[PDB]
């Protein structure tokens, strides 16, 4: 329902103070419509429920 | 678990215009021209001056 390049300018985008990470990372897969990302196994639960 | 087959989609647009129009005119195109003997009566005055 959503466009995966504009949900991953929001939560990841410019410099790392805007950035809801500390050291991972957002990549998009236009082909499928997904989110690839690397991070702590905590932080990726609470960015799972806010972009559901 | 990234590469897998796609889904085909297929788009078709329908451009339709209609256009309709009614035109009348009426018009009238009338004149006299008469003497008498020392009077006259037309529709100018180089009318009066030509019957004479």
Do not use: C, Y
Request: glycine share 10%.
């Amino acid at each position: 329902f959503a466009k995966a390049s504009d949900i991953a300018a929001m939560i990841g985008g410019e410099g790392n103070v805007n950035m809801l990470s500390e050291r991972g990372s957002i990549s998009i897969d236009e082909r499928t419509n997904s989110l690839l990302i690397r991070e702590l196994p905590d932080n990726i639960a609470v960015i799972r429920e806010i972009i559901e | 678990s990234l590469d897998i087959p796609v889904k085909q989609v297929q788009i078709e647009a329908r451009i339709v215009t209609v256009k309709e129009g009614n035109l009348e005119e009426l018009g009238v195109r009338w004149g006299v021209m008469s003497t008498n003997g020392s009077h006259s009566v037309g529709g100018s005055i180089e009318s009066n001056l030509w019957q004479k």
